[PDB]
Design an enzyme around this catalytic site. Structure first.
Site, PDB file in Angstrom:
ATOM      1  N   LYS A   1       0.899  -1.169   0.000  1.00  0.00           N
ATOM      2  CA  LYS A   1       0.000   0.000   0.000  1.00  0.00           C
ATOM      3  C   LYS A   1       0.915   1.191   0.000  1.00  0.00           C
ATOM      4  CE  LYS A   1      -4.837   0.292   1.458  1.00  0.00           C
ATOM      5  NZ  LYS A   1      -5.638   1.531   1.659  1.00  0.00           N
TER       6      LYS A   1
HETATM    7  C1  LIG Z   1      -8.978   4.999   0.043  1.00  0.00           C
HETATM    8  C2  LIG Z   1      -8.110   3.998  -0.723  1.00  0.00           C
HETATM    9  C3  LIG Z   1      -8.741   2.611  -0.537  1.00  0.00           C
HETATM   10  C4  LIG Z   1      -8.137   1.885   0.700  1.00  0.00           C
HETATM   11  N1  LIG Z   1      -7.541   0.603   0.414  1.00  0.00           N
HETATM   12  C5  LIG Z   1      -8.413  -0.542   0.361  1.00  0.00           C
HETATM   13  C6  LIG Z   1      -8.046  -1.237  -0.947  1.00  0.00           C
HETATM   14  C7  LIG Z   1      -8.273  -2.694  -1.133  1.00  0.00           C
HETATM   15  C8  LIG Z   1      -8.856  -3.508   0.019  1.00  0.00           C
HETATM   16  O1  LIG Z   1      -7.970  -3.412   1.144  1.00  0.00           O
HETATM   17  P1  LIG Z   1      -8.411  -3.674   2.672  1.00  0.00           P
HETATM   18  O2  LIG Z   1      -9.517  -4.684   2.579  1.00  0.00           O
HETATM   19  O3  LIG Z   1      -7.117  -4.129   3.332  1.00  0.00           O
HETATM   20  O4  LIG Z   1      -8.976  -2.353   3.125  1.00  0.00           O
HETATM   21  C9  LIG Z   1      -7.937  -3.280  -2.349  1.00  0.00           C
HETATM   22  N2  LIG Z   1      -7.434  -2.597  -3.392  1.00  0.00           N
HETATM   23  C10 LIG Z   1      -7.139  -1.270  -3.354  1.00  0.00           C
HETATM   24  C11 LIG Z   1      -6.594  -0.605  -4.590  1.00  0.00           C
HETATM   25  C12 LIG Z   1      -7.460  -0.485  -2.111  1.00  0.00           C
HETATM   26  O5  LIG Z   1      -7.238   0.867  -2.020  1.00  0.00           O
HETATM   27  C13 LIG Z   1      -8.935   1.593   1.960  1.00  0.00           C
HETATM   28  O6  LIG Z   1      -8.211   1.938   2.890  1.00  0.00           O
HETATM   29  O7  LIG Z   1     -10.075   1.037   2.104  1.00  0.00           O
END
Ligand SMILES: CCC[C@H](NCc1c(COP(=O)(O)O)cnc(C)c1O)C(=O)O
Ligand SMILES: CCC[C@H](NCc1c(COP(=O)(O)O)cnc(C)c1O)C(=O)O
Lengths: 297, 297
Positions: free
Chosen positions: A152
């Site tokens: 990330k």
């Molecule tokens: C605001 C950017 C999005 C951000 N990332 C969540 C996110 C996920 C799913 O990740 P997790 O389930 O660990 O949250 C998958 N893919 C991307 C490109 C993401 O940004 C979020 O924090 O939910």
């Protein structure tokens, strides 16, 4: 209204949590961040899978070569202290961000020490709970041979921005991206699931996606519920022909996809069951999962 | 020692030129920047191709969808005011950076207004003037179908960081990157030229490179000097077999490459001629080119 923000061991006002515009993190996309939710159940505030998010923060930093001088334990405590210090008693989105606070033009970032800031912010729903309309976008997800997409990492998200803006400008709620090989991999900020002939399918890590903690949560949920699950590549045709599809993510939670490029999909039963279960889990009503909830108070 | 920095119309101390750690520019690599040199010739301070750099800043911003509320003229004046206000009488590297100063978690960056900061910093040589040792790195240059590499966009530079760090860690001065199709395209922060059988060759824009203003300068120089020049794809083998090779860039100037992956190359005559000419041009000794020099005083 002015909330407190953790920054290298110290609680400061939001207005004082600032980085030099000459930072190589600002100039060159060289940092890592997280997304962590805390849910208010009426009796307490629970941060969901706090430790997992902080260990991922450090995996991200190790992946891109950023030195984060805090442990996952410290970072976890910091989150709790920060939510306390603000006295929130409501749903939060928490943003840790690790970056270089020294000004530096040189791309040689070896030996630098990251700072970390942690902010907590009131946050309700990110996508329509009834379901969103999605478009496969022209932008391809960035590829592993060029940038470490499993991390990330901040600079990678210019890719998610192009995707998200393109879908939103064209009237839709969310983007779906294909990878370099044409496989469906990810929303701009979500992992994706489909259901085909009663089997739950989500792209495998190797397809070049973020290893989402919600994704992982849903994989355990499916284990508990007896739903057969494959980590398998998905093509556009399978998505068009899916019995159901949904996005998952910290911000996004569990959100059905009711339309993809004009093709209608039912708000389906597996999506619904997973969304209901995930809500029970995060609100503290499922005993088996309580180890994933950190009480703030 | 504390220098002044332009920031949205106002000169402030470096220490006050800071952006919220919640900026989508910091979190998601969503901004654009420039690199501009000013050279001291003994009688004046000349900013090289100022206007060209500021028009590129705005092309970059248009490419990624960032709204920059200043014109190239304003931005140019700002640079001059900033160098004056500091009273520099020496070689400078100038960093304009355009970013979002509002805190924002959402990837939906539509309708935002960029701020611009401009800093000027004393700067001598970036690469060894006698020649550098370069390595083709494992990281591929990011591809146009994923990120807009022709723009000098901040989040893209995580790619240049991985490249630069890898070469430097392995003992070399600089990285060379291949594109997705295996063609030699760019250093981590330089465009690249080779000379093969007396013809000067540099990868074409379509290969996925930054449209460097030094690159463009060298193309005009070659026109003036009668050196045949092709904008043609270059493979690794051609680079290994080149009669000469060199990097070019604002910071890098004109720098010979005397070694590539252990293969030795002569510091060659065309490189030398181009380096000597470029120095005369930037120091004000070539009348034909004076329209490219902006006097500070
Ligand atoms: C605001 C950017 C999005 C951000 N990332 C969540 C996110 C996920 C799913 O990740 P997790 O389930 O660990 O949250 C998958 N893919 C991307 C490109 C993401 O940004 C979020 O924090 O939910
Ligand atoms: C410090 C990052 C390098 C930075 N960009 C210069 C640069 C160039 C050549 O561009 P120009 O000739 O317009 O300068 C080519 N390619 C890349 C990846 C660059 O960073 C520089 O400002 O010189």
């Amino acid at each position: 209204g002015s909330m407190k923000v953790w920054l290298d061991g110290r609680l400061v006002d939001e207005e004082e949590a600032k980085v030099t515009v000459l930072s190589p993190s600002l100039n060159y996309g060289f940092g890592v961040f997280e997304g962590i939710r805390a849910y208010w159940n009426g009796e307490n505030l629970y941060v969901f899978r706090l430790r997992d998010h902080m260990e991922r923060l450090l995996r991200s930093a190790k992946i891109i070569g950023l030195d984060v001088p805090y442990t996952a334990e410290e970072l976890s405590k910091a989150v709790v202290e920060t939510v306390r210090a603000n006295g929130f008693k409501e749903d939060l989105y928490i943003r840790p961000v690790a970056y270089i606070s020294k000004p530096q033009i040189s791309l040689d970032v070896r030996g630098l020490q990251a700072s970390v800031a942690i902010a907590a912010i009131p946050f309700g729903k990110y996508l329509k709970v009834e379901g969103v309309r999605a478009a496969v976008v022209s932008w391809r997800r960035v590829h592993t041979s060029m940038m470490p997409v499993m991390a990330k990492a901040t600079g990678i998200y210019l890719n998610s921005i192009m995707a998200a803006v393109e879908a939103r400008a064209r009237g839709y709620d969310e983007a779906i991206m294909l990878n370099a090989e044409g496989k469906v991999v990810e929303g701009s900020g979500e992992n994706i699931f489909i259901v085909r002939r009663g089997v739950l399918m989500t792209p495998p890590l190797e397809d070049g996606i973020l290893e989402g903690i919600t994704r992982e949560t849903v994989i355990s949920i499916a284990g508990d519920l007896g739903i057969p699950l494959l980590e398998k590549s998905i093509t556009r045709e399978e998505l068009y022909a899916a019995d159901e599809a949904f996005f998952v993510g910290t911000a996004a939670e569990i959100t059905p996809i009711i339309e993809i490029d004009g093709r209608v999909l039912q708000r389906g039963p597996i999506t619904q069951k997973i969304a209901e279960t995930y809500r029970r889990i995060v609100l503290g009503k499922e005993e088996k999962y309580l180890p994933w909830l950190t009480p703030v108070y």
